[PDB]
Amino acid sequence: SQPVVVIDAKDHLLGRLASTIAKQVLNGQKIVVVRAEALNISGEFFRNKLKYHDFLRKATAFNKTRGPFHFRAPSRILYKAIRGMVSHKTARGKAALERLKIFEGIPPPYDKKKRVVVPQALRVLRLKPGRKYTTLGKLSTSVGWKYEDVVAKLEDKRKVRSAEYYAKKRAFTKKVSSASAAASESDVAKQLASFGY
C-alpha cells in the first residue's frame, strides 16, 4: 500500500520478478527496481551467454539501425523482460511503463528508503539447490557493458555509509531496550499484555 515501492533485486530470478512486476505495474503501482546488477537467472553461464548471442544475431538486414536493439545494461535486460510482458504498443501499456524505473546499484534518491523483496521470485526459494544459476552482472559485462566496475565501486562507497547508519541505530535500540525494561513492571503493561499487546 506504499505509493513508491523499492525492490531489492539481489538474488531474484529474472523472469519471475519481471512477471510479478508487470502484473503489479499494470494495476497502478509505481515500482522502482534497484541494484539489478545482482539479479539471477537460471541455467549455467555459457548457456545463457549463448541465449544472448542468438539474440545479437537478430537484426534488420537492410539497415541494422532499424531492427531489435540489443541493450546491454542489466537494468535494460530486465527492462527487455518486463516490456515483453506488458502490451506496450498501446496507451495502457505505455502508461504502465511510465510507472517503472530500474537502476543498477542503489542511487542516492533510494539509498535511505526501505527495500522490499519478492518472495515468490527469489532464487533461494525457487531454485533447487545444486542447480547452476547466473548473475546478471557477470553476464551483461560479457556482452559489452562497461560500467560494472563503477557500480561495484559506488556500491562499496555506500555500504560503508549504511553500515555507519546501522551502528548508530543499533546503539539507539540498545539504550531503548535497556530503558524500557523498567517500564515493563507497571500495571498498564499488566493491563495491555492481556489484550495481545
Binding site: 530503558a179 524500557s180 517500564a183 498498564v188 493491563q191 495481545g196 499487546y197
Partner: protein
C-alpha cells in the same frame, strides 16, 4: 587431539516422537506427535490431548517444533496419550515464545471495538512513560 572448530547446522530433525504443529487442513493449528516414518515426504502422526486422529499426513502440511519426547516407534493411541503426559509436552509448549505469539496473534484478532479503543488510550500511557524513562538527549 588439538582444538577443532565447526559451525554448520543444528536442525529440527524428523524422528519418532517429535512433536509437530499441523498447519494445513482439518486439524489446523493443533499439536501432534510423529510415531512412524513412512518415507522422506510422508509420516504417521497422533496427538490425543490436542484431539487429532491418527493420520498419515505428508510433511508438506506439518511444521516441526523444537521439542521431542521419547516413545517407541509405532505406538498406539493408548500409548501416545500416556507419554504425552508422562513427558509433560503441552505445558512445555506453552513455555516457548512460539506458542506465546500464536496465542497473541489470535487474541489480537478477537478484540471488539471497545478493546480496540482501550488499547490506544492505554498505549498513550505506555508512550508517556518511555519519554520519561528515556528522558535525555
Amino acid at each position: 587431539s588439538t582444538d577443532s572448530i565447526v559451525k554448520a547446522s543444528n536442525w529440527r530433525l524428523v524422528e519418532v516422537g517429535r512433536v509437530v504443529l499441523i498447519k494445513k487442513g482439518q486439524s489446523a493449528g493443533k499439536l501432534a506427535a510423529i510415531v512412524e516414518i513412512i518415507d522422506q515426504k510422508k509420516v504417521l502422526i497422533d496427538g490425543p490431548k490436542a484431539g487429532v486422529p491418527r493420520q498419515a499426513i505428508n510433511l508438506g502440511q506439518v511444521v516441526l517444533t523444537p521439542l521431542t519426547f521419547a516413545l517407541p516407534r509405532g505406538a498406539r493411541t493408548a500409548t501416545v496419550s500416556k507419554k504425552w503426559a508422562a513427558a509433560a509436552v503441552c505445558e512445555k509448549w506453552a513455555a516457548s515464545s512460539w506458542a506465546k505469539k500464536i496465542a497473541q496473534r489470535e487474541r489480537r484478532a478477537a478484540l471488539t471495538d471497545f478493546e480496540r479503543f482501550q488499547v490506544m488510550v492505554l498505549r498513550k500511557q505506555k508512550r508517556y512513560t518511555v519519554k520519561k524513562a528515556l528522558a535525555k538527549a
